């Protein structure tokens, strides 16, 4: 009996991730539309969706993925990103889905450098989008361990992860008011050595990102 119970437990999970991957990929596909995002935000169904979204990403990252589960979480991370790309979407996420923003910040710290590189980029993109909203920048940069998270993520050798970290950093340093205490002290908390090292990188896009970020830092 035990074996029969475990057997269809596995059978229930593979169906669930299959449905999840199919439904959410369709949603991710159409979420690039502003009108689709506005429609999604309509109702309390947005709340329940983003709630269960954070749980699934968390539940899957903790299991460390097959091409089914991985496509599922990619879609979830892609939807959040595209919602956050719309002004009212990032405004909705910081007012109504701070738990999900916390989960995203947490999960970026659980993933060791080199695992789920594409999931990190997607999550980093959503954070960047949220940081365009003024409350969103405040909540993110006030999150405990936010700056340490940047160092942790910059230890990934993948250039695309590093490009998107520097994008997030670029966003945060352009706001001096939220700066932790002294502006010069906040600069010293940033991974300057890693940024300067990347300002001499083979990757052209990453080299320019780090080099421009270096300019902003020197002129404060």
């Amino acid at each position: 009996q035990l074996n029969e119970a475990k057997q269809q437990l596995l059978q229930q999970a593979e169906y669930c991730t299959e449905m999840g991957a199919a439904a959410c990929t369709l949603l991710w596909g159409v979420s690039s539309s502003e009108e689709v995002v506005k429609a999604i935000l309509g109702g309390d169904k947005a709340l329940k969706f983003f709630s269960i979204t954070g749980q699934t990403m968390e539940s899957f990252v903790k299991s460390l993925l097959d091409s089914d589960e991985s496509q599922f979480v990619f879609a979830l991370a892609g939807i959040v990103t595209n919602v956050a790309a719309i002004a009212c979407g990032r405004e909705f996420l910081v007012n109504s889905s701070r738990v999900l923003l916390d989960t995203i910040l947490q999960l970026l710290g659980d993933l060791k450098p080199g695992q789920c590189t594409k999931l990190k980029v997607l999550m980093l993109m959503s954070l960047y989008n949220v940081s365009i909203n003024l409350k969103g920048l405040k909540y993110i940069s006030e999150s405990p361990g936010f700056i340490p998270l940047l160092w942790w993520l910059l230890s990934d050798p993948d250039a695309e992860v590093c490009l998107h970290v520097l994008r997030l950093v670029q966003s945060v340093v352009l706001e001096p008011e939220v700066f932790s205490k002294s502006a010069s002290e906040f600069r010293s908390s940033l991974p300057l050595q890693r940024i300067l090292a990347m300002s001499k990188s083979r990757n052209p896009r990453l080299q320019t990102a780090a080099q421009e970020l270096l300019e902003d830092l020197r002129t404060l």
Binding site: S32, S70, Q71, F74, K118, V121, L122, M125
Partner: peptide, 7 residues
């Protein structure tokens, strides 16, 4: 799964 990043 590949990802197109239109700004």
């Amino acid at each position: 799964p590949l990802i197109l990043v239109g700004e």
